[PDB]
Write a structure and sequence with these properties.
The structure holds 2 protein chains of 2 kinds. By secondary structure, chain A is mostly loops. Classes of the chains: A little secondary structure, B alpha+beta. Bound molecules: the ligand CC(=O)Nc1cc2c(-c3ccc(C(=O)NC4CC4)s3)cccc2s1. The site of the ligand CC(=O)Nc1cc2c(-c3ccc(C(=O)NC4CC4)s3)cccc2s1 has 16 residues of chain B, from β3 and β8. Chain B: Residues 3-253 form the Protein kinase domain.
C-alpha cells in the first residue's frame, strides 16, 4: 500500500 | 498583520494557507518550533536562525524551480516563514497516487524540472537532503514543478556527512549501513527513488534490507532506457552513480517538453 513517509 | 492566515494544509507539518493583504497574493505560512530545531544557522547579520531560512535565502534568486521565501519572522518560541503558493497546485505525491504510474513523457518533463531545480540548489551551496514526491509541488496551470521544504537541508559541502533527518526510504545504502554519505551521490540516489516512483507509481524499497539489497524490480512496463538510468542512479557504490551531467545526457532524458507543453498535454 502506497503511503507518505516521515522526515 | 501583513498576511491573513487561513486553514492548515502533509502530516506532522505545520503549514497554513495565507493571503498577503497588500496585493492579495497566495502564500504558505510555515511555523517552526524553536525547541524542535535541530540544525541552527547564522545570518550575515549574525542573527541566529534555523538552517532552513539560510538555505531558502541562498536559493531564492528568482529561479522559479525552487519555492521562494517571501519573508520570515521571529517569535518567542517559533519562527514563521512566508513562502509563495502557486494556484492551482497539487503535490507530486498526491498526483502519483491519483494517476498511478506516469507516462514516460510526463515523467521525463517532471524529472528534468526536478534536476534543474536540484542543480540550482547545489550551485547556490544548498543541499536539500529530502528529495521526494511529497516535497515537489506542481503548478497545474504553468506545468512548472517547484521543490519545497528545506527543513532537512544543509549547506552543500564536498566532504562526508554523518547526520541525516530526511526520509529513510529515500536514503542511500551507505547511510543505512555506515551512517555516512556524500551530498551529490546521496541526492542522485534519492532522484533514482523518485524516478522509479514516477514510472512505477510507487517507491521501490520499504525496508533497509531492500535498500541495501539494490535489487530493482519493475512492477510496470518501463522502457529499457529509463530502467537503465534508474538502475544507474540506484547503484550501491556511490562512486558508480552518474553525475548530473551524465543523468542529463542519458538517452532517456533527450527531447524534454517545455513546462508549458506539459500543462497542455498532461494537466489540462
Ligand atoms: C513541511 C513543509 O515545509 N511543507 C511545505 C508545504 C508548502 C507549500 C504547499 C503545500 C501544499 C500546498 C497546497 O496548496 N495544497 C492544497 C491541495 C491544494 S502549498 C507551499 C510552499 C511551501 C511549502 S513548505
Amino acid at each position: 500500500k502506497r503511503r507518505r513517509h516521515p522526515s | 498583520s501583513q498576511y491573513q492566515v487561513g486553514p492548515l494544509l502533509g502530516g506532522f507539518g505545520s503549514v497554513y494557507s495565507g493571503i498577503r493583504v497588500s496585493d492579495n497574493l497566495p502564500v504558505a505560512i510555515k511555523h517552526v518550533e524553536k525547541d524542535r530545531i535541530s540544525d541552527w544557522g547564522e545570518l550575515p547579520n549574525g542573527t541566529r536562525v534555523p538552517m532552513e531560512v539560510v538555505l531558502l535565502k541562498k536559493v531564492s534568486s528568482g529561479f522559479s524551480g525552487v519555492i521562494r521565501l517571501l519573508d520570515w519572522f521571529e517569535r518567542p518560541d517559533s519562527f514563521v516563514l512566508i513562502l509563495e503558493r502557486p494556484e492551482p497546485v497539487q503535490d507530486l505525491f498526491d498526483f502519483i497516487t491519483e494517476r498511478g504510474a506516469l507516462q514516460e513523457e510526463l515523467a521525463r518533463s517532471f524529472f528534468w524540472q526536478v534536476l534543474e531545480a536540484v542543480r540550482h540548489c547545489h550551485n547556490c551551496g544548498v543541499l536539500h537532503r529530502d528529495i521526494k514526491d511529497e516535497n515537489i509541488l506542481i503548478d497545474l496551470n504553468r506545468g512548472e514543478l517547484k521543490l519545497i521544504d528545506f527543513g532537512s537541508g544543509a549547506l552543500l559541502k564536498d566532504t562526508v556527512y554523518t547526520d541525516f533527518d530526511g526520509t529513510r526510504v529515500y536514503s542511500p545504502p551507505e547511510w543505512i549501513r555506515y551512517h555516512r554519505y556524500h551530498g551529490r551521490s546521496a541526492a542522485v540516489w534519492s532522484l533514482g527513488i523518485l524516478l522509479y516512483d514516477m514510472v512505477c507509481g510507487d517507491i521501490p524499497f520499504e525496508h533497509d534490507e531492500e535498500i541495501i539489497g539494490g535489487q530493482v524490480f519493475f512492477r510496470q512496463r518501463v522502457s529499457s532506457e529509463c530502467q537503465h538510468l534508474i538502475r544507474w542512479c540506484l547503484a550501491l557504490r556511490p562512486s558508480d552513480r552518474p553525475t548530473f551531467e551524465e543523468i542529463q545526457n542519458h538517452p532517456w532524458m533527450q527531447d524534454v517538453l517545455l513546462p508549458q507543453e506539459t500543462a497542455e498535454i498532461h494537466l489540462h
